[PDB]
Design a protein around this ligand. Structure first.
Ligand SMILES: [Mg+2]
Ligand SMILES: [Mg+2]
Ligand SMILES: [Mg+2]
Ligand SMILES: [Mg+2]
Ligand SMILES: [Mg+2]
Ligand SMILES: [Mg+2]
Ligand SMILES: [Mg+2]
Ligand SMILES: [Mg+2]
Ligand SMILES: [Mg+2]
Ligand SMILES: [Mg+2]
Ligand SMILES: [Mg+2]
Ligand SMILES: [Mg+2]
Ligand SMILES: [Mg+2]
Length: 157
RNA sequence: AAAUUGGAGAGUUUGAUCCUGGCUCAGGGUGAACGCUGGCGGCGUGCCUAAGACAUGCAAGUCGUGCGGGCCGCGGGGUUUUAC
């Protein structure tokens, strides 16, 4: 029970003697606007069917974004193939200043203020993935402190 | 140049795809010009070209408490032919 978004829809061709033969691809985001978002890419031979598919997939591929007051805990830059996303967190009332794709993903995550640039290939699908991977990677003076102290944590805390 | 105050992309090579890569667009700006249209005010601002040629008018004068005198006169005096 999340909101869904359409990143993008495309049509694609095979070949058989006597014609092209088509298939559809849907890129779908799914969020609960409070720190959980999932991305799904589904292909079927019919467009709405593909989206259904896509939506199913999205919910299985879910990522808990640690939102820190409308924004993300530190800056971060992530490459995926040719494509590369940068996420710089921002102050209140800044807005999601991000491209076409990352926005949709960020918005449904529950993010409200954040800085962004795409870089390298701009391909939707990889930018989609680079963003989801970027968010999959964020940590906290908390998340981090446990990793480093860790090996005797709870002596100082 | 004292809240980390700040960063959006899209179209286009293929039957489709990923990359490379160039082309192109949306933004902001002007000592602007051109089209269509044009009610009022305030503040700015107006030869970017031939540093080409220039009619006319004005654009640096002032001091008589530094000094003598020409011209046109006003008074007021002394005085050898009523001129000095
Ligand atoms: Mg986490
Ligand atoms: Mg690379
Ligand atoms: Mg902050
Ligand atoms: Mg490129
Ligand atoms: Mg491009
Ligand atoms: Mg070729
Ligand atoms: Mg074609
Ligand atoms: Mg303009
Ligand atoms: Mg007119
Ligand atoms: Mg001239
Ligand atoms: Mg000139
Ligand atoms: Mg002259
Ligand atoms: Mg004197």
């Amino acid at each position: 029970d999340f909101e869904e978004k359409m990143i993008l829809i495309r049509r694609t061709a095979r070949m058989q003697a006597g014609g092209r033969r088509f298939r559809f691809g849907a890129l779908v985001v799914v969020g609960d606007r409070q720190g959980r978002v999932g991305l799904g890419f589904g292909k079927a031979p019919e467009v709405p069917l593909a989206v259904q598919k896509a939506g199913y997939y999205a919910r299985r591929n879910m990522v808990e974004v640690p939102l820190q007051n409308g924004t993300i805990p530190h800056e971060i830059e992530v490459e995926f193939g040719a494509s590369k996303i940068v996420l710089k967190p921002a102050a209140p009332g800044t807005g999601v200043i991000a491209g076409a794709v990352p926005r949709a993903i960020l918005e449904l995550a529950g993010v409200t203020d954040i800085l962004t640039k795409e870089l390298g290939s701009r391909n939707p699908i990889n930018i989609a993935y680079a963003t989801m991977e970027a968010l999959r990677q964020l940590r906290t003076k908390a998340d981090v402190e446990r990793l480093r102290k860790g090996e005797a944590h709870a002596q100082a805390q």
